């Protein structure tokens, strides 16, 4: 896989691929790698599909219970921490999970990286999965805080494309999300095959590839 997420002036972008592999065999062309925990909280998925689905869907139960007890939405910081504490119970038992908890709360937009080791990091930009290195290349050179919603959505989309092209275990399609203070907004499923040719022509990139 390839997943990414980054904060900017108008919230946080979240982009993921949709490929699933079982060895060298492509088992799934279209796997959802984003979980909708609540209207203001998203969770990316990388690593073991089962672990990512179970524990993040269990996080949503616990984030929902928070709202009922307190009459108030859970913070991104607190949600990420609940998840990291779960990972810490099954410490060394063999779980494989790498996720970014993206959302908007009272402190503004929030982004936390969490993995199976229990690591929990706050940051402006993250990328996980086998193709994260390719995505970081595009992100680091083109990222600004002063990005427009339109340009930011494209950057995340273009970054996944870069990874999907080079990484054999990344591809299928791109799922985009934009998190605002009114909640997250889905920005569609984009087939990489079609997107690649489109970007090639419009941008002029991928000159080495023939089409």
């Amino acid at each position: 896989t390839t997943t990414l997420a980054f904060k900017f002036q108008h919230g946080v972008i979240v982009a993921v691929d949709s490929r699933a592999t079982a060895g060298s065999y492509i088992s799934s062309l279209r796997m959802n790698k984003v979980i909708e925990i609540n209207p203001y909280l998203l969770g990316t998925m990388s690593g073991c599909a089962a672990d990512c689905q179970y524990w993040e869907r269990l996080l949503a139960k616990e984030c929902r219970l928070y709202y009922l007890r307190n009459g108030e939405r859970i913070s991104v910081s607190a949600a990420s921490k609940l998840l990291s504490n779960m990972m810490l119970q099954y410490r060394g038992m063999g779980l494989s999970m790498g996720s970014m908890i993206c959302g908007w709360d009272k402190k503004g937009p929030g982004l936390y990286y969490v993995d199976d080791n229990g690591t929990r990091l706050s940051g402006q930009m993250f990328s996980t999965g086998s193709g994260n290195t390719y995505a970081y290349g595009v992100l680091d050179s083109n990222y600004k805080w002063d990005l427009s919603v339109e340009d930011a959505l494209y950057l995340g989309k273009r970054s996944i494309l870069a990874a999907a092209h080079r990484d054999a275990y990344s591809g299928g399609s791109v799922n985009l999300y934009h998190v605002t203070e009114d909640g997250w907004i889905y920005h569609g499923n984009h087939d990489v095959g079609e997107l690649f040719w489109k970007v090639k022509e419009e941008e002029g990139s991928f000159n080495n590839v023939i089409g």
Binding site: R91, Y113, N117, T119, L121, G123, F126, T128, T133, Y136
Partner: protein, 195 residues
């Protein structure tokens, strides 16, 4: 996280800790603060296996903060370091030991003395004028052995610390993305924002 240094000068303790966090072959973060304030005049830096470090640090922090509230009193750096050591010595024979090395820099308000304690994951405690964990000492101790005096000012301590970091940056194969430096003295804990 791999790199943590400590130096005790005349009237303060200085802790320097790297900023890098690596996942697989990628550096995820270059601004990570590998430290927790245990009490107003006690700071603990840490380094070891992923996850265990922060958990252990926060667990210790919670215990010391609990003590502070219960007794309305700040434990001495020595007392804190002994508590931390016992927790690690307890840990090493557990089913799953916490793989964490720490430096505890504190200013004892009773004795009016800075104090630096070095504790590894086995629960091996030593009080030192300067210390380090992992490979950090291999590069830096020769400089510290040469330049260190006990009557050094905080500014001289920072200059000697810069020299240590420069040597690390020259001879270490790993890029640790610089260090966050913090000073512990009679007035409490503060961060040097330009280093």
């Amino acid at each position: 996280m791999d790199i943590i240094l400590g130096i005790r000068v005349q009237d303060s303790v200085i802790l320097a800790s790297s900023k890098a966090v690596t996942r697989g072959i990628s550096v995820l973060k270059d601004s990570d603060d590998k430290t927790r304030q245990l009490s107003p005049h006690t700071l603990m830096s840490f380094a070891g296996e992923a996850g265990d470090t922060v958990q252990f640090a926060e667990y210790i922090q919670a215990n010391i903060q609990l003590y502070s509230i219960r007794e309305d009193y700040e434990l001495s750096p020595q007392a804190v370091s002994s508590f931390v050591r016992q927790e690690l010595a307890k840990s090493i024979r557990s089913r799953r030991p916490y793989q964490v090395n720490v430096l505890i820099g504190g200013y004892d308000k009773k004795k009016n003395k800075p104090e630096l304690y070095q504790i590894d994951y086995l629960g091996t405690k030593v009080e030192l004028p300067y210390g380090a964990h992992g490979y950090s000492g291999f590069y830096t101790f020769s400089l510290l052995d040469h330049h260190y005096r006990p009557d050094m000012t905080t500014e001289e301590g920072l200059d000697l610390l810069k020299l240590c970091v420069q040597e690390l940056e020259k001879r270490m194969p790993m890029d640790f993305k610089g260090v966050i430096v913090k000073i512990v003295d009679k007035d409490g804990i503060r961060q040097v924002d330009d280093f």
